[PDB]
Amino acid sequence: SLECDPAVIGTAVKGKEAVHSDLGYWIESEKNDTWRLKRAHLIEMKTCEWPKSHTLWTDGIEESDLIIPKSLAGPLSHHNTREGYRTQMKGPWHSEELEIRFEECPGTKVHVEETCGTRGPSLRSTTASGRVIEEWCCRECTMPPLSFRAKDGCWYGMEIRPRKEPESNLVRSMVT
Amino acid sequence: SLECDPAVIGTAVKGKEAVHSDLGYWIESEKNDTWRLKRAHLIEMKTCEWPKSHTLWTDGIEESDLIIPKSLAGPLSHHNTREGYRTQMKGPWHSEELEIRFEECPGTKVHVEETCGTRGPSLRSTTASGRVIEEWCCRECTMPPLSFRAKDGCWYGMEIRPRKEPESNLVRSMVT
């Protein structure tokens, strides 16, 4: 009864590309050389549960590995995963139009440094003053780095933290 | 590995209809209160394993309820199920062109009789002499009856057995 309406759900695979689509959700996965989330575009956030009947590869997943959270109608699929990243509970979900993609934000860099901060609330790449933050670090995530493209700028994943920058000046999402 | 080549596999859902397709397999499933196998068309039998990456609703199934056996490249899906039927291990899989459909054979009728024979190898609807066998019985399967349409005639499912036949006249598939 809490599932999204399957009347408008469209899921398809052909070869090495897959799409989990909805009215507002367009979730692309690829095989390279294992299946992973490629990019996603969400225009209307919703809180239903994506039905297993309209989902591919629903076996042996834990909700902690779902890139798009299950509570936000993220599909319970291995196609909704990426190595080195976990569920993005504290992401910039307040925005209306969201694009999830694996690319560095403009004028930014991410480094794999075990001497880096742990996962925390998602950080925007521009200060409240509006200035770019050049250097970011990661402890376990993989490259290219998970990013969020919204109206107000580029948001980085939780695993991605800034280098020698005070996380107190930055803008942080306050949703879960 | 032991999986079918995913390069040519195409699976899609839109609303109440779903297809698990490949080069030789065309498996249609439908939503009618519950997800079930609608019809299937197989032109080349295979012994690979259908990849879960290209399969819908792979969760909480037992292989005994898969209409198309896992060994015969049947998808491990709730879409590959039908109420009152179990895996058709002893089916007419020797034939080249096979169509699975839920309909009575042209000169037969099937009744739900708990006082009927048990599961056995799939039987043709025409004797070796070539005459139709009008009456068949079922104990637990549902209607319409699962049937196989091949070049040599109509084959009934394992759950569907005849009442007035001495088991010697019939044509029995001898493959598993």
Numbering used by the authors:
A (entry chain A), B (entry chain B): 176 to 351
Pull text from the paper.
The flavivirus NS1 is a ~48 kDa conserved non-structural protein with two conserved N-linked glycosylation sites and six intra-molecular disulfide bonds. NS1 consists of the N-terminal β-roll, the middle wing, and the C-terminal β-ladder domains. Two NS1s are assembled into a symmetric, head-to-head dimer through domain swapping of the β-rolls and the extension of β-sheets from the β-ladders. Although not being a component of the virion, NS1 represents a marker for host immune recognition and evasion.
To understand the function of ZIKV NS1, we solved the crystal structure of ZIKV NS1172–352 from ZIKV strain Suriname (KU312312). The crystal of ZIKV NS1 β-ladder domain (NS1172–352) diffracted to a 2.8 Å resolution in Fourier space. Two β-ladder protomers were found in each asymmetric unit. These two protomers form a symmetric, head-to-head dimer through an extended, 14-stranded β-sheet seen in the dimeric assembly of DENV and WNV NS1 β-ladder structures. The dimer interface buries a total surface area of 1628 Å2. In ZIKV NS1, K227 forms a salt bridge with D234, while H253 interacts with W232 through a π-π stacking interaction at physiological pH. Remarkably, T233A, one of the mutations found in the Natal_RGN strain (KU527068), which was isolated from fetal brain tissue with severe microcephaly, is located at the NS1 dimer interface. The hydroxyl group of T233 is central in organizing a hydrogen-bonding network across the dimer interface. In particular, it has been shown that T233 also plays a pivotal role in organizing a hydrogen-bonding network across the dimer interface in other solved ZIKV NS1 structures. These structural data suggests that mutation of Thr233 to Ala would disrupt this elaborated network, and could potentially impair the stability of the dimer. Over 49% of T233A mutant are in the monomeric state. This percentile is much higher than that of the parent Suriname NS1 β-ladder domain, suggesting that T233A mutation interferes the self-association of ZIKV NS1 β-ladder domain.
